[PDB]
Design a protein around this ligand. Structure first.
Ligand SMILES: *[C@@H]1O[C@H](CO)[C@@H](O[C@@H]2O[C@H](CO)[C@@H](O[C@@H]3O[C@H](CO[C@H]4O[C@H](CO)[C@@H](O)[C@H](O)[C@@H]4O)[C@@H](O)[C@H](O[C@H]4O[C@H](CO)[C@@H](O)[C@H](O)[C@@H]4O)[C@@H]3O)[C@H](O)[C@H]2NC(C)=O)[C@H](O)[C@H]1NC(C)=O
Ligand SMILES: *[C@@H]1O[C@H](CO)[C@@H](O[C@@H]2O[C@H](CO)[C@@H](O[C@@H]3O[C@H](CO[C@H]4O[C@H](CO)[C@@H](O)[C@H](O)[C@@H]4O)[C@@H](O)[C@H](O[C@H]4O[C@H](CO)[C@@H](O)[C@H](O)[C@@H]4O)[C@@H]3O)[C@H](O)[C@H]2NC(C)=O)[C@H](O)[C@H]1NC(C)=O
Ligand SMILES: *[C@@H]1O[C@H](CO)[C@@H](O[C@@H]2O[C@H](CO)[C@@H](O[C@@H]3O[C@H](CO[C@H]4O[C@H](CO)[C@@H](O)[C@H](O)[C@@H]4O)[C@@H](O)[C@H](O[C@H]4O[C@H](CO)[C@@H](O)[C@H](O)[C@@H]4O)[C@@H]3O)[C@H](O)[C@H]2NC(C)=O)[C@H](O)[C@H]1NC(C)=O
Ligand SMILES: *[C@@H]1O[C@H](CO)[C@@H](O[C@@H]2O[C@H](CO)[C@@H](O[C@@H]3O[C@H](CO[C@H]4O[C@H](CO)[C@@H](O)[C@H](O)[C@@H]4O)[C@@H](O)[C@H](O[C@H]4O[C@H](CO)[C@@H](O)[C@H](O)[C@@H]4O)[C@@H]3O)[C@H](O)[C@H]2NC(C)=O)[C@H](O)[C@H]1NC(C)=O
Ligand SMILES: *[C@@H]1O[C@H](CO)[C@@H](O[C@@H]2O[C@H](CO)[C@@H](O[C@@H]3O[C@H](CO[C@H]4O[C@H](CO)[C@@H](O)[C@H](O)[C@@H]4O)[C@@H](O)[C@H](O[C@H]4O[C@H](CO)[C@@H](O)[C@H](O)[C@@H]4O)[C@@H]3O)[C@H](O)[C@H]2NC(C)=O)[C@H](O)[C@H]1NC(C)=O
Ligand SMILES: *[C@@H]1O[C@H](CO)[C@@H](O[C@@H]2O[C@H](CO)[C@@H](O)[C@H](O)[C@H]2NC(C)=O)[C@H](O)[C@H]1NC(C)=O
Ligand SMILES: *[C@@H]1O[C@H](CO)[C@@H](O)[C@H](O)[C@H]1NC(C)=O
Ligand SMILES: *[C@@H]1O[C@H](CO)[C@@H](O)[C@H](O)[C@H]1NC(C)=O
Ligand SMILES: *[C@@H]1O[C@H](CO)[C@@H](O)[C@H](O)[C@H]1NC(C)=O
Lengths: 334, 334, 334, 334, 334
């Protein structure tokens, strides 16, 4: 109610307050509770192995030196006063690049409570590093984490606990990933023992299961249809060598074009993937079909009956072998 | 007219002023009237799901600590004095990267009125996230919003409203996006009850309808023409096996190439859209035409009359099926 | 010319000087002459509809409060003194991203003259926004401007004029652009009546004409060559249908490939372009050629005389129709 | 355990501490031990010949001006006090771009010991430059270094050394790169004599060996298969001129397409590489095959026995010559 | 060397020192000797027409106001002290983005000598604009200059010179450009008479000659081979019309594909280049070959002897004309 009285109280609290000293200095470690409200996951990139995360990050502790009485109201002070208070040396272990928004002001909130309780909130957009195993891509299921740790202090000086247990991290439900779909998020709290000593550690881990419909429609289906078309050559009269040659080589060319342009579109992740195995299997299949036709034409003149027998045998073997290969591929990667 | 008198008045007003105290602290919430004058909309990135906007953002309120007498003319102060007054902690809920233009000086305006009225203007460019459902793309209509909220204060301390009813936001017609076309913009003034409590909320949302002519001329028309060309093989005698084989397979190759180049040129949004269904339908059609020719060629030796009848049936079946497919597609996506 | 005396005079002038108060407060508006010396127009990006510019921008204005006497020289002070003066709130209406170079120091020059006049120069690299009309691309003629306006002051307080008349802008001739040749630059001074009174406005506009040689040699010529090659099928014995089918379909494939690759190379602005119209016209022509050949081959057995007549008439019509289409295209767009 | 007593001790330590003077200024050089704990290696781009690194950098030394007695605790101070001390002018010789993360605070640790020993830690993400000789790419083996030097001081003022011997650098094993695989890291400590004087110099070097399986699967195998397909025309009766013409020319087109697409997908370093030699060799082989068929067709009508002999000799020579070329390629570059 | 005495000396020197006043203000100009030690040149971009350069920039002058006595040893100070002295307003005329490396400390050095001599060192990376002409690309040879000039002061107040003559710039030998090869570097010390007076201007120019082997292997050789293959149709019996038509049209397709892929790979610089003329020439050659064959086929039935004569004449005319064109081209650009 009295602006001047509140100002006097705040100035008295700030007077004699040494920001260079943590609260309860020389005593038991000060516990800090952390709450994360994930506004949205911006973008996941396999090329850079990173995901952009936008969130509200709030820390909660108690500083005795800041305890004040006579004003029952919680004091949500202006952000600019935050520079005048001790704050935890919280940082994210695996953020490649992070920043705090500043429009129209720094997205920063300080709230004091009569018992000396301090609440400090930030709005952070951080690009965290998530190493991914893409052997089973695009049928992959990644597990991307965000780590939180104190920088200078140890467990003897500061301890981290999740504020609210499994309810501490909110907003997972409303996250919209156009390509992925969040399956499960977990919170872990523990201590990491470096050679220097023990440090607090908090981990927020999501598991993301990748959508597959787009890759089935746009990637696998063209290859399957090209492989099927390659078998048209079998039901062709052997005398019409020109048409069979044109069909086989054109299907091979189409397979090469789709493979290379998919590689161009798909991320440049340099190692083997399931999609690569399937595409090379289809390519080997069409190549073998053309080779079989060449063998048929070669032995066609000497033993036409054996050539016809080979052609009709391939008419069954090639679709059968392709189906068997597809069954093996789907079982292995599902 | 006396600059010394004005300087004395300003020094008196700033003397003892506490930036940490909102106007009428401990009393009624302070009303804030916000206006946005949009300069232009830069880009609408579907890949990153965000739009870039530039606007003059003005906040209007009253602070009694700044009321002065004797000077009828309003005080248009330098932008640096804004660092010494109190300003609302306005922030944007769905922004990813925003900044204030500072050339040549920071684009910040402070205007004080004799009755303590304060007007505070910025020139802000922001990249606001906007989740897009591109299933009906490119025939889709999107709805991109901009949310404005007080980061620290609650509805008990501050209240937002649009200064000027629905005339608060201007320049919508002056926006000229080459790609989209603005349909309707709405201003919403509400309250949101988070776990902490109630916050004001001002939402300015546009609905954009994507222009279609470019995709009609550049994407659908070539696919339709290739589909039509695939039907040429029907008006060919079965003897010209090489001719029909080459025609069908080259139409298939052309379809694949145009599909791949459209996929690469179009945004890499990795899920099924309308255009992809259309392209796969056309590809299925050319595949079926080639397969039909193969079947006719195989059965022509045994039952030439039956094969000729099947071909002449296909001559009309294929265009009819394609027309039905197009009708179904263009009803399902209109 | 004593260094200590000069320092004392400068301190005295800065003593009792209020930055927040404009000169001639509550009196005549302060005139501000402006000069621009353009160093180099970096790039003109059509995709982002913007252009990068680098220039020397100088503001020249009288100031009674800074008048000094007894020193004949015009003081040239460090940039770090400019923060202690009053400067006009000049900004640019349509700069997406503008900044001032700061290596090895801020490119800011302050010069004071005994009569109280002040010269203030900056070196600025600004990315201005230029909305382009590409309906006649690449034969377009853009008009890209730069607007200069006061931010918080009105014409009742500050006036902008081009100091030097039509010569106030220099270095336009030395500008070099890979794709454009500057035709004409214009300077305009006016006052724009916003809601909050009038505002001074200085517009500097350029008209840019796009070079056509690269597009002619790289886009239109190959399309014309393939169009001509389409007619080759006309001077072919129709009995050998396989060769003609291959020729027509492969010309269509080549046309599609070049069209897609030009789409990939050319900017991705999604609407109608003259180049697009030309490419679609050529594609339509080759498609019609293949269709005519198919119809001739179909009717070749009913009456060879009619087929030969149709073929020989096509040999005349298609070059004639193509020439007429080219005439229409080059006359409509020029 | 006395807060005010420790504050007094810290103020006394900072009382008269001159930052601008090195410890023991004018006396023996101050030995500085350095440790690096590498968090991760972000990426290794050959396009810019640079790799991004992130690590904790710790400097350990002694300053007599910062020695305290009576307080057994190691004073772990706030980061903001680091600006009031002296720290070595350590810098990296080849950092194109580097920064210190500031979320949630600048990751800067200051720790003081009773004996005046100071430990100073930073979390640095940098972009080191690493020139690469990719002639043997993708079978290359890069040597990428990070060099550390004093910017202003000489060996007479400061002497860098590795703290704790070769164990000064940790986290090498935890580094994971999708494409490479660390073989060995080395630490070098020395002095470098310039014209001005001798500078201490530290060097941390990595030897990265590139993974080869991805390119075997993606690039070499398609080319080998295309070469084998080109060989097919040898086992084709020379009467089928159209068949062999189509086969050879289509194989050439396929080789061109894969060559161009692989050149685009691969990094754009503009000089010769082993993979380029391999692709040009395959192109040479397919060109020779088509030329051989052309010669056989030309001489076929005159001396058919000679033409058949040439074809059957090509049947053996071409696979043999290709095997020899592959042997040369996989012996020289391995 | 006494710490307290040195600190007293430094404080005395800074006592009353005015940064805004240049040394010998109002008197003779102060000569500045500048050395540049180039560490590396990152990249040269034709798309942006600029080169990235990292260097040590050392200025050398004398300010008697800072002259000290009694300390024979030279002094080296923390970079922060540079904020309290006078330094020249040096800048680079043709830069686009420049920054002083600031890890760990700002890469800045200040050294003082008893005679008042000041040495000032920066570690600067800048992207300098170099207007590159690429008519003769890739056989071109560029001349890229970095200009250095004062901003506010003129030749009356300050003069620029190279400290070390032609040895002022070092490290040019160590520069490693994979794309280019440094041929010569020159230093000039001109004066420029702008409308505001005469300014010093130190120019450092490089001449870079582009390495060409990569383009010969990857760009010219495929075109030559395709042109050669286009002549295969000449050694084909005219009866086999299908084979020759397919060969010609497919060679045209391959030429178009390689030209388009080169366009995509080559920098988007939109004006005619030597490589474009060469590719257009090759394309015209294969187009004329196909046209000649078509004319031969048309005239074959009426005058078979003339057709045979034309076919046998082309086998020499086309290779001879192509060799003549190649001679003209490779003599024009070499
Ligand atoms: C992505 O992948 C990471 C791993 O790389 C997953 O993170 C792991 O999650 C599991 C749980 O799912 C964690 O396991 C937990 O470890 C805690 C710490 O254990 C240490 O300390 C204790 C003493 O305090 C020692 O005894 C122990 O040996 C370790 O040194 C435990 O306290 C937890 O116990 C809880 O669960 C068990 C049952 O599993 C119960 O019996 C307990 O009562 C208690 O409830 C638990 O064991 C593991 O530590 C995490 N890894 C790391 C490195 O911390 C992510 O979960 C995954 N992402 C997703 C979305 O799942
Ligand atoms: C893009 O998509 C967004 C949603 O994602 C759309 O935003 C919605 O816009 C509509 C209006 O078009 C909003 O509806 C309005 O909400 C107001 C606020 O309601 C709250 O407060 C009132 C009290 O003030 C409470 O009674 C109520 O329970 C809420 O707590 C209402 O005041 C508005 O009332 C109007 O309509 C009613 C009838 O429905 C009339 O009786 C009233 O007189 C009045 O005319 C209205 O209901 C909606 O809230 C917005 N969504 C969200 C999440 O807030 C955008 O409109 C869309 N883009 C475009 C271009 O349409
Ligand atoms: C790119 O496109 C822009 C427009 O989008 C062009 O800018 C226009 O340029 C023309 C000149 O070529 C400008 O026309 C001039 O406007 C001046 C301002 O008029 C206003 O203000 C005055 C008071 O100051 C009012 O009286 C008046 O009603 C307006 O409100 C006039 O003063 C000029 O008049 C002079 O020339 C005319 C003949 O043209 C004479 O009759 C007059 O006596 C006088 O000498 C003139 O009319 C126009 O205003 C500009 N646009 C804008 C928005 O300002 C660029 O030129 C174009 N780029 C290129 C390269 O051409
Ligand atoms: C990537 O490439 C870099 C080079 O570009 C490699 O770095 C080199 O590593 C070697 C070691 O493997 C370094 O060699 C060492 O140099 C030290 C400095 O030499 C000076 O001082 C000595 C006296 O101490 C003088 O004799 C000498 O003339 C110099 O003035 C030496 O001190 C080292 O000596 C060690 O080995 C010798 C035997 O060879 C022993 O007798 C010594 O006791 C001692 O153990 C050693 O010679 C070399 O200097 C590094 N290069 C540079 C430029 O410094 C990287 O190793 C490479 N990457 C990988 C992964 O290997
Ligand atoms: C890239 O291209 C630029 C030009 O665009 C080249 O820069 C030129 O470099 C040459 C030197 O290589 C410069 O020529 C020299 O200029 C000096 C300054 O001239 C001014 O000052 C003198 C008085 O001091 C006046 O007389 C004169 O009018 C000018 O006002 C001269 O002092 C030099 O003279 C010396 O050499 C000449 C022969 O060249 C002798 O005859 C003289 O006796 C004397 O020894 C000389 O003329 C030229 O000015 C530069 N041009 C520009 C625009 O800066 C770059 O060199 C080129 N890149 C590379 C790698 O070469
Ligand atoms: C100081 O400023 C005055 C005022 O601009 C300069 O006087 C001008 O001098 C030029 C020639 O150099 C004349 O063409 C102008 O007409 C003069 N203007 C006026 C108002 O007198 C003077 O030259 C400047 N001197 C210095 C050393 O900068
Ligand atoms: C302005 O007010 C000051 C302070 O009262 C006074 O000293 C001065 O004379 C006044 N000047 C004018 C022009 O009114
Ligand atoms: C010039 O200034 C110096 C320093 O203040 C002073 O000692 C000297 O007397 C002055 N001389 C004149 C002529 O003003
Ligand atoms: C703690 O420090 C305060 C302030 O210096 C002092 O008054 C008090 O006596 C000290 N107490 C002890 C036990 O050192």
């Amino acid at each position: 109610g009295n602006m001047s009285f509140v100002k006097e109280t705040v100035d008295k609290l700030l007077k004699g307050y040494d920001i260079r000293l943590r609260p309860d200095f020389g005593g038991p470690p000060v516990c800090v509770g952390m709450n994360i409200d994930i506004a949205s996951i911006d973008m996941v990139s396999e090329v850079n192995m990173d995901y952009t995360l936008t969130m509200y990050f709030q820390q909660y502790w108690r500083d005795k030196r800041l305890a004040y009485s006579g004003i029952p109201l919680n004091l949500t002070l202006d952000n600019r006063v935050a520079d005048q208070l001790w704050v935890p040396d919280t940082y994210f272990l695996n953020d490649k690049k992070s920043f705090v928004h500043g429009v129209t002001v720094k997205n920063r909130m300080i709230r004091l409570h009569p018992d000396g309780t301090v609440l400090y909130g930030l709005r952070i957009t951080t690009t965290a590093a998530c190493m991914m195993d893409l052997r089973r891509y695009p049928l992959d299921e990644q597990n991307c984490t965000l780590e939180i740790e104190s920088y200078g202090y140890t467990t003897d000086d500061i301890e981290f606990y999740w504020r609210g247990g499994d309810k501490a991290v909110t907003g997972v439900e409303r996250i919209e990933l156009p390509q992925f779909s969040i399956v499960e998020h977990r919170l872990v709290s523990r201590n990491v023992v470096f050679a220097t000593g023990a440090y607090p550690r908090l981990s927020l881990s999501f598991r993301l299961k990748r959508n597959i419909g787009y890759f089935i429609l746009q990637t696998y289906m063209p290859s399957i249809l090209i492989t099927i078309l390659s078998w048209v050559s079998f039901w062709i009269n052997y005398d019409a060598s020109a048409a069979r040659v044109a069909l086989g080589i054109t299907t091979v060319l189409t397979m090469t074009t789709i493979n290379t342009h998919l590689r161009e579109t798909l991320p440049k992740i340099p190692y083997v993937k399931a999609i690569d195995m399937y595409l090379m299997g289809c390519f080997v299949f069409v190549f073998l079909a053309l080779l079989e036709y060449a063998f048929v034409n070669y032995i066609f003149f000497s033993q036409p009956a054996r050539a016809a027998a080979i052609d009709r045998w391939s008419r069954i073997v090639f679709p059968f072998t392709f189906s068997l290969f597809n069954l093996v591929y789907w079982l292995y990667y599902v």
